Amino acid sequence: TAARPTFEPARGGRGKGEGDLSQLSKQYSSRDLPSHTKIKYRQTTQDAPEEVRNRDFRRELEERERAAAREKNRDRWDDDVVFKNCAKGVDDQKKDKRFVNDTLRSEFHKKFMEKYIK
Amino acid sequence: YYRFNTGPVGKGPGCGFWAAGWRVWLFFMRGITPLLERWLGNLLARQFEGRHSKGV
Ligand SMILES: O=P(O)(O)O[C@H]1[C@H](OP(=O)(O)O)[C@@H](OP(=O)(O)O)[C@H](OP(=O)(O)O)[C@@H](OP(=O)(O)O)[C@H]1OP(=O)(O)O
């Protein structure tokens, strides 16, 4: 009826630049004014294709992998109270290292719901 | 006016030194000219070409 889905999209090729520039209109947006009218290219130090062509990538990749693994390695009175020490060996129980692919059982969402509802 | 209405000269109208405001409003026109030429061009182009329904 009025409220209905699509089941097919609108096709392109029949408006403002599609076949004859829509028969050469004299209407143009402010987003269609000249802007960034000069392509910047890669310089010799950046990653120009002259420099990329002779490079052996596997040796450099293995060296950077080795350096990353080496960096990760080198980084790493009232005695009469009715309840005793309840936390004996709880050394913070690393929930903040775990990452869960579930927006309802994540750690960020449990922190969210703990913070924003009292 | 503070430089103009200094001594014996009072606080009447009597002051045409329109060069400053004249420069200010012509420098307005310097930049409003592209904007209005684009806007009036699109106005005339829609009046004489018609409105493109779902073209953009
Ligand atoms: O009434 P005041 O606040 O003292 O200021 C006025 C006011 O200028 P301001 O925009 O600086 O307030 C008048 O402008 P109008 O908005 O009333 O038109 C102006 O008279 P004209 O601008 O019409 O010349 C007049 O100038 P003056 O009274 O010196 O002729 C000037 O008075 P002051 O210079 O004493 O502030």
Q: What is the DSSP string of A57-79?
A: HHHHHHHHHHHHHHHHHHH----
Tokens of A38: 């000069």
DSSP state of A110: H
Q: Does residue A109 sit in helix, strand or coil?
A: helix
Does residue B17 contact residue B4 with C-beta atoms inside 8 Å? Answer: yes
Q: Please tell me the distance from the alpha carbon of residue A26 to that of residue A42, in angstroms, as a whole number.
A: 37
Residues in CB range of A13: below 8 A, 6 or more apart: A19
Resolution of the experimental structure, in angstroms: 2.9
Q: Please tell me the distance from the alpha carbon of residue B11 to that of residue A14, in angstroms, as a whole number.
A: 68
Does residue B45 contact residue A26 with C-beta atoms inside 8 Å? Answer: yes
Instruction: Measure in Å the smallest separation between the Cα of B30 and chain A Cα atoms.
Output: 18
B46 contacts in A (CB within 8 Å)?
27
- What experiment produced this structure? cryo-EM
Interface residue A15 vs chain B (CB under 8 A): yes
Mutation target among A27, A29, A32, A33 for the B interface, most CBs of B within 10 A: A27
Tokens of A83: 């309840």
